[PDB]
Amino acid sequence: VTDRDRLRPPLDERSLRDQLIGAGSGWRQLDVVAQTGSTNADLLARAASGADIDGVVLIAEHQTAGRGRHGRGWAATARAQIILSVGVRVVDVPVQAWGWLSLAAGLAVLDSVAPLIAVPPAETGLKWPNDVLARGGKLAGILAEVAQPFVVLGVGLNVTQAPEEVDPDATSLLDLGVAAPDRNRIASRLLRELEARIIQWRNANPQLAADYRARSLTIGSRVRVELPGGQDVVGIARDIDDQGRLCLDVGGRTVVVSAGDVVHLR
């Protein structure tokens, strides 16, 4: 709606830099751009041209050619989301563990916005592998992409974004009852949470996996998983292994899925 535009002031880049760059913080660079095709693509391109993107933050007020998983997209309107990418050096960490970086990001996003809701409705938490859900709706999507020696982590978080503007299965903080969400405050908390989770991931801290499990909507639920290639597998999600893969119980058999789309069943 056009009235939501009144609920969408621009980000304050200088304030964000003052809060997030300096002693005690690992973020080295932060930029807010008015518009770009894809923040993930932009940081990947910087790394491809030789830039050190570790601890580099890129935030876009609007994103016109957003990327989703598996060649899919991501829709946005100006100032309605927190749209950002960060660079993470990962070569120091065993490749088998890189999948958990993606899970850690979702946890960070959830923790950054969870206290803003008055009362958390049902189906609020993390859906494997990259979904922040609230009231069954997709509140945020996360995309991790590889560019040696880095991983670029992308976050699209619906702040005031109306589902009619982007996707029927979407939701936003505003549509969850948050009357006046402050993107500046939320972005600051998000990046603070993200730094901590990245540090935990790098040092293989057991609390990362523990905190993820505590917020998982998928573990323990009957699920239909749509695998790359189109095949569906129905079972009950039981756990996440040390590679960040989803472990399914299929009639007593174990099926471990590295990638796919999860649908929570009755």
Ligand SMILES: Nc1ncnc2c1ncn2[C@@H]1C[C@H](CNS(=O)(=O)NC(=O)CCCC[C@@H]2SC[C@@H]3NC(=O)N[C@@H]32)[C@H](O)[C@@H]1O
């Ligand atoms: N705004 C939106 N909110 C909720 N759902 C949305 C949406 N826009 C589109 N959809 C759905 C959701 C569905 C795709 N889901 S997915 O395959 O699991 N992929 C993801 O969720 C990762 C998205 C990462 C986006 C960030 S934003 C910053 C960074 N720069 C990027 O270019 N990308 C990242 C399909 O695009 C529907 O149309």
